[model samples]
Target: TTMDVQSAADDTGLPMLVVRGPFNVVWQRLPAALEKVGMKVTDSTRSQGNMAVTYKPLSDSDWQELGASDPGLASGDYKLQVGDLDNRSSLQFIDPKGHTLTQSQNDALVAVFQAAFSKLE
Candidate 1:
């Protein structure tokens, strides 16, 4: 089976995840899913598929969906970048420092996103 997310990198060498779905489908359902995953969408760039928000583990219980654990990402401000591919998608997490997460660091963030990803329709 294809992994819902696979470690990847953006043009700037920033770490990201290659998602296994289309951009429009992902974007249309993204907002609600984010909230369901416990994210408060502060702002978003529909055209670019990006959003800004503060991180916390409000979805700790939502982990039931994935039968997972706590959000491994630290609590703080973050910018999420989603990119379009003809038939796939990409997501990147920008830390408060305006820098990207390391591969291992992003791995944990990816883990933290299990619940959010579960709602991804």
Candidate 2:
């Protein structure tokens, strides 16, 4: 399954899922984008000397290569951009503001994400 959000499932009365998709690419917008869409992000360390992000336990194998905090069992399309930090700042990295995502970096990020999911499946 590609996207299986247990929290959303239980809270929203959606079907509880064991595995739910053929999606190899999971995505979501970051910072304001997610908030705009009403999705809440937790357990991520953007600043305050904390690590940025990492992979969830189930998807932890290949996700380690990406170098950030894990989304941790989030089962849906996520934007996958930089997260908000303790200073309440975001997009301080290669995101929508400074410049567009380079083709090579975009491809590499996609590849890493694919590897993360595949390792779990």
Candidate 3:
């Protein structure tokens, strides 16, 4: 009843990835992976099979433009959401308003996260 979820794009095409496994396991690992990549978690909450984190980049051209000297000090806003899907977990990149990014942006963004998630395997 517990194992790595096969990685795949969401059928909704909504800038998301799905993993089939225990919710708590994915919940714990998700933020850890983001932290390993130098992302700072500004806020996080989990309930009713959903987890969301508002994070800022540690150091990148994007964060630099926003004057983030440290990981959580950036003015930029990045949100990550994870939802329980039957036996799978859905991880997605979304705007503050809960809308998917544009197609090109989503493709690139998903690929970046996908690479990071692969390391967790």
Candidate 4:
């Protein structure tokens, strides 16, 4: 697992995740990670160094169909940001208006990432 979410502080007022490992490996698994949490990758471009994803909470049945264990989680539609961090990789959940996600939302997403990333080598 390469993902590590640091404690959120008032300094930036945003949740930060450090994906420590080879950048190529991190980039390759990102799409699957988002999908595991019921998010859809609306757009992705490796050369551009970013992906546009939409939050779409999957139902228990949906998870079952995907052969996944459902956590029965729910979330609002928000655009998630994924990109490279000079030395590592980073993921941020930010709203259209540029507001940081709430602590609960941040924690939920972080947990999802943690679970998803854990499944990878």
Candidate 5:
């Protein structure tokens, strides 16, 4: 796998990732990465570098896979924002509303995503 992953945040403390490739590569590997959390790409546009997925709060076992206990992921539709960064990509997990979740929630999900993303190409 060519993908490397790191946890990050936006100015508002929203959970995100600094990824090793362009958005296109991240977009292509999204399904497999999200699958680790039981999410699926419901809508997407490669040119725009955004996709949609529904969040379902994960089980304890699932959270363990992410290296965290339950951090309480709320259920709702979310936008997976993958932006072009020339040689890299910015991946943000934006919830249904613009509200910022607790830092624990933000960090845990970022951990979940990066854990899976680091294993994908």
Candidate 6:
């Protein structure tokens, strides 16, 4: 079976918003988890030990890949899913479980990423 891996390469220099947990334990899992999401990975070429997946949504208005110019993800509840394309996994936004995060939450998420990918010099 083929692996449905979706990566988020920050070519835009924008901080990519990813779920926190075991899936993010290693950088490689980041793309894999992304693929599990709704991303329609177009090229896995740049994908190596560290890679990002670029995909487009069903609509043409705009893309939701990792290369977006947005610095932070919108405030909303999201679940993680995974599987091959054939029996692809599904993610659903449960109950009022979805809502714009508070200022503090957003700030916290940003801080987390900053610490995770801190560059020296």
Using lDDT, give the best candidate's number: 5
Q: Give candidate 6 regions above 4 Å deviation.
A: 1-24, 40-50, 58-121
State the C-alpha lDDT per candidate. 0.70, 0.30, 0.56, 0.62, 0.71, 0.31
Order by TM-score, highest first: 1, 5, 4, 3, 2, 6
- Return the lDDT, model 6, position 65: 29
Q: Between 1 and 2, whose TM-score is larger?
A: 1
Error of 2 at 25 (Å): 9.9
Q: What does candidate 1's lDDT look like per residue over 1-121, in tens digits?
A: 2327677778877788776678877676666666755667788888877889776665655666555565466777888888887677888888778888777777765654554666553
TM-score of each: 0.76, 0.27, 0.57, 0.67, 0.75, 0.23
lDDT tens digits, residue span 67-110, model 6: 22222444333432221223322111111443333434334444
Better of 2 and 6 by TM-score: 2
Per-residue lDDT over 1-121 for candidate 3, one digit per residue giving the tens place of the 0 to 100 score: 5333333456775556666555677777777666544555666777754444555444566434333233222234567667777677776666666676555554444434444555565
Tell me the deviation in Å of residue 54 in model 4: 2.0
lDDT of 5 by residue, 1-121 (tens): 4666667777766666777777677777788888777677799887777788876767888777665455466778878778877777887767777555555676666667666765453
Candidate 4 CA-lDDT value: 0.62
> Which is the winner by TM-score between candidate 1 and candidate 4?
1
Model 4 residue 31 CA deviation (Å) reads: 0.7
Error of 3 at 68 (Å): 22
User: What is the clash tally of candidate 4?
Assistant: 0
Model 4, residue 4: distance off in Å is: 4.5
Query: What is the C-alpha local distance difference test score of candidate 5?
Result: 0.71
